[PDB]
């Protein structure tokens, strides 16, 4: 299914343009520096589109990861 809970839902109004709120951005990455799909980010074309750009600017600065190791398997 994948209906655990939209990331957007569990959250307040934040500035999607802010490439430093590592606090919240941290929320749109999976158990890997991978940017969550819309059916998880619960965002929308436009938003989801600016999210991605933000997240990347961060990764570069060094605030967000590019990729994590999976802990299980």
């Amino acid at each position: 299914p994948s209906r655990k809970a939209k990331v957007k839902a569990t959250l307040g109004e934040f500035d999607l343009r802010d490439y430093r709120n590592v606090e919240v951005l941290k929320r749109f990455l999976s158990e890997t520096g991978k940017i969550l799909p819309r059916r998880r980010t619960g965002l929308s074309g436009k938003e989801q589109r600016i999210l991605a750009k933000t997240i990347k600017r961060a990764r570069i600065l060094g605030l967000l990861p590019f990729t994590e190791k999976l802990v299980r398997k």
Binding site: G12, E13, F14, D18, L61
Partner: protein
């Protein structure tokens, strides 16, 4: 002129002196190029997602200036020159696109 946001990440192992010295050359250069400082935020040390120059931490600077766009790129060649400056990123300022509001 346009409003930009400069990002700087230096070596988190600089002593009171060296550290404030870098801010010297920086504050200097910013002006030397036409950067009119509209304000600053200095979070300082932060845990990097991944190591930047073996160093697993970083010292972050953040200034929002107003400068002649025709020189932005040079202003950053300059900033990158310093050895303790390990990350530079100039961004065009933008209205904060909210959501979940």
């Amino acid at each position: 002129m346009r409003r930009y946001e400069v990002n700087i990440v230096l070596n988190p192992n600089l002593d009171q002196s060296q550290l404030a010295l870098e801010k010297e050359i920086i504050q200097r250069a910013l002006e030397n190029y036409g950067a009119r400082v509209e304000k600053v935020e200095e979070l300082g040390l932060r845990r990097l997602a991944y190591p930047i120059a073996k160093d697993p931490q970083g010292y972050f600077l953040w200034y929002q200036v107003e400068m002649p766009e025709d020189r932005v790129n040079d202003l950053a060649r300059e900033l990158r020159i310093r050895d303790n400056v390990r990350r530079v990123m100039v961004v065009k300022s933008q209205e904060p696109f909210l959501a979940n509001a």
